[PDB]
Amino acid sequence: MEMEKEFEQIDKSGSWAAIYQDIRHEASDFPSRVAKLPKNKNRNRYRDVSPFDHSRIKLHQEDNDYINASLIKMEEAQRSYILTQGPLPNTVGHFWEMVWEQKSRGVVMLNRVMEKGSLKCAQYWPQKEEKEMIFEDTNLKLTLISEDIKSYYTVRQLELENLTTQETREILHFHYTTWPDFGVPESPASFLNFLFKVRESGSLSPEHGPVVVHCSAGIGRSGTFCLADTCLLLMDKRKDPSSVDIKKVLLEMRKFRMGLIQTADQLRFSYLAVIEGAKFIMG
Numbered sequence: 001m002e003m004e005k006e007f008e009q010i011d012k013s014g015s016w017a018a019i020y021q022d023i024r025h026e027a028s029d030f031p032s033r034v035a036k037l038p039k040n041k042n043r044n045r046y047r048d049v050s051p052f053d054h055s056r057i058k059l060h061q062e063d064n065d066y067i068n069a070s071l072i073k074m075e076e077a078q079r080s081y082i083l084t085q086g087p088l089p090n091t092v093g094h095f096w097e098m099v100w101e102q103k104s105r106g107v108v109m110l111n112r113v114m115e116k117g118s119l120k121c122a123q124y125w126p127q128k129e130e131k132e133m134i135f136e137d138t139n140l141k142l143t144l145i146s147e148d149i150k151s152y153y154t155v156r157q158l159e160l161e162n163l164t165t166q167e168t169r170e171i172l173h174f175h176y177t178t179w180p181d182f183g184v185p186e187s188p189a190s191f192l193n194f195l196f197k198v199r200e201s202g203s204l205s206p207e208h209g210p211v212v213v214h215c216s217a218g219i220g221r222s223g224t225f226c227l228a229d230t231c232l233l234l235m236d237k238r239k240d241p242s243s244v245d246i247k248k249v250l251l252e253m254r255k256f257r258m259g260l261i262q263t264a265d266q267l268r269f270s271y272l273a274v275i276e277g278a279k280f281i282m283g
């Protein structure tokens with residue numbers, strides 16, 4: 001079926017939970033043996049969220065190459081994404097090592113450091129120009145260059161220096177700051193505006209490594225971001241945009257990381273975002 005009328009048909013029939021459970025039943029199951037090794041327990045935020053072995057990002061390190069991060073490679077859309085958990089106190093150095101080694105331009109953050117009164121990720125970037133951060137375990141230096149605070153999101157320019165080689169690179173930090181503590185946003189308008197700002201920066205384009213996107217577990221809000229982006233790109237590429245099937249795209253992405261889209265409300269929100277976004281693109 002088309003999307004917008006399939007949407008109204010699920011609303012009128014109140015069957016979002018059943019649609020979402022079907023997706024959960026059909027989703028891929030691949031091994032995640034490296035994630036479960038005892039030496040990696042303090043590298044995982046949640047015991048039930050792990051990268052598959054076949055698609056995990058490897059650190060270029062002979063001691064321990066493990067990080068909780070997955071490469072989502074979308075062949076028809078010609079887009080790739082790295083989805084990862086919010087960094088832990090003992091993985092902030094690994095996080096920036098990955099950004100460097102994968103040649104990423106942008107980092108997309110969809111959570112606040114504290115939500116619901118608890119810590120959802122480490123404070124992994126510097127908040128003042130004159131107070132830079134040094135990660136001694138991976139030999140990187142990180143400096144805040146500029147910060148632009150808007151009503152729904154903040155964009156930061158950061159400098160990452162590999163202290164071994166003295167090479168430097170400019171990284172863009174896109175921080176969506178207004179996702180509610182509970183539920184999903186009422187309108188997708190600010191989330192779509194944010195997606196378009198990431199696109200306009202070059203951070204999603206083939207001349208760079210894959211964008212790094214995270215929330216707390218790296219599957220819920222993070223899944224909503226890449227699902228909406230890929231569906232909109234396919235609608236632009238194809239002769240028949242009504243042939244884009246959001247459930248089929250989601251199942252393709254779940255071949256590369258488990259659990260993408262965590263609730264039936266996130267699934268409904270993803271439909272809403274793609275529907276509204278397809279009108280603004282046009283024409």
Ligand SMILES: NC(=O)CN1C[C@H](O)c2ccccc2S1(=O)=O
Nearest residue numbers: 089092122123124133134135136
């Ligand atoms: N002095 C240090 O140990 C260096 N670190 C870098 C950074 O300050 C940071 C940020 C958030 C959490 C942990 C750390 S750290 O301890 O790894």
